[PDB]
């Protein structure tokens, strides 16, 4: 779209690379620092999608 | 409608007669790069599914 199509998502953050021919549609807040990622988001807290 | 990369959909084909040469007119693609078998002799081998 001229405004922009935002309907397509992808995964960026994971604990490790997955094996060939597997999928994972689970959504959770990745921990990217010593500060715990209890919920929502924050510094050193990344939403992978 | 096509699925997203993180939620790709698996579609199965079984118990039919295929013709891998009719797909040229379906979409305006050019490369059709293939790995394990030559595109020349796709309609001669017999698969499982």
């Amino acid at each position, epitope marked *: 779209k*001229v405004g922009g*199509n935002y*309907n397509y998502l992808y995964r960026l953050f994971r604990k490790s690379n997955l094996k060939p021919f597997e999928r994972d549609i689970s959504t959770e807040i990745y921990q990217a620092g010593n500060k715990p990622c209890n919920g929502v988001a924050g510094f050193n807290c990344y939403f992978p999608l | 409608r096509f699925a997203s990369v993180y939620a790709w959909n698996r579609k199965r084909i079984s118990n039919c007669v295929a013709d891998y040469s009719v797909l040229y007119n379906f979409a305006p693609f050019f490369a059709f790069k293939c790995y394990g078998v030559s595109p020349t002799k796709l309609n001669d081998l017999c698969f499982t599914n």
Partner: antibody, heavy 119, light 109 residues
Framework: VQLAQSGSELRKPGASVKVSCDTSGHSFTSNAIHWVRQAPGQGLEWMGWINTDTGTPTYAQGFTGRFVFSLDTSARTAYLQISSLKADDTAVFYC?????????????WGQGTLVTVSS | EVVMTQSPASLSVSPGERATLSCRARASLGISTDLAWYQQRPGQAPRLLIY???TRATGIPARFSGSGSGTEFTLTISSLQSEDSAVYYC?????????FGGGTKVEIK
């Protein structure tokens, strides 16, 4: 819902017909316009669509070549052009518009345009 | 390509009686709730009736109800009215030979 569409005309064989489809009545979260044709006594059948902001038409199987889809300089008013009318060419031509993006069901429809072939 | 078949061809029932129409699509892999219903009174253009499997659009009363899944779909109506003289069609937005059904010619006695 009530997009302004051109009225009916009477045409002789071999002439040309111009049909417009005004759009500015409402607000649209889409970038396409569609056309629907109906025979005088039969059902509905599609012909194609053109992409707004690109001006690229798309034709169906049995409605290629002779039909012409055009847009406006503002890319809002869509015009339909046909030439070399036949005796069986008489039908009604509608103009359908999408509701939201990637929602391929038509909600906004023009009132319809009638084309008659006679002498 | 996906093509519909619709029966019965025509309907002639007095107003106020429940009626059911079936639209079946001949597709090996099905449609998966990608169907819509349309109502076209003589004269004016067809107006949207039901989009999706059963959801209703804006400005339509809750009189109409629909159901179906996979390959077969059925429409149920109640409290038929005189002004509902129209021919009902079904459309699949599943592939990109966009086509319509054969239609059901519903007549008010």
């Amino acid at each position: 819902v009530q997009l302004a569409q051109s009225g009916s005309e009477l045409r002789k064989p071999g002439a040309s017909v111009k049909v417009s489809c005004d759009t500015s009545g409402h607000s649209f979260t889409s970038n396409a316009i569609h056309w629907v044709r109906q025979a005088p006594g039969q059902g509905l059948e599609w012909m194609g669509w053109i992409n707004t902001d690109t001006g690229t038409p798309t034709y169906a199987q049995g409605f290629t070549g002779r039909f012409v889809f055009s847009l406006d300089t503002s890319a809002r008013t869509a015009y339909l052009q046909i030439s070399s009318l036949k005796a069986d060419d008489t039908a009604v031509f509608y103009c359908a518009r999408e509701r939201d993006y990637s929602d391929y069901f038509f909600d906004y429809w023009g009132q319809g345009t009638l084309v008659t072939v006679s002498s | 390509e996906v093509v519909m078949t619709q029966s019965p061809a025509s309907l002639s029932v007095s107003p106020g009686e429940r009626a059911t129409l079936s639209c079946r699509a001949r597709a090996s892999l099905g449609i998966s709730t990608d169907l819509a219903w349309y109502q076209q009174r003589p004269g004016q253009a067809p107006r949207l009736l039901i989009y999706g499997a059963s959801t209703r659009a804006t400005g339509i009363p809750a009189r109409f109800s629909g159901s179906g899944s996979g390959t077969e779909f059925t429409l149920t109506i109640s409290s038929l009215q005189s002004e509902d003289s129209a021919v009902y069609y079904c459309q699949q937005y599943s592939n990109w030979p966009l086509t319509f059904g054969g239609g059901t010619k519903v007549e008010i006695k």
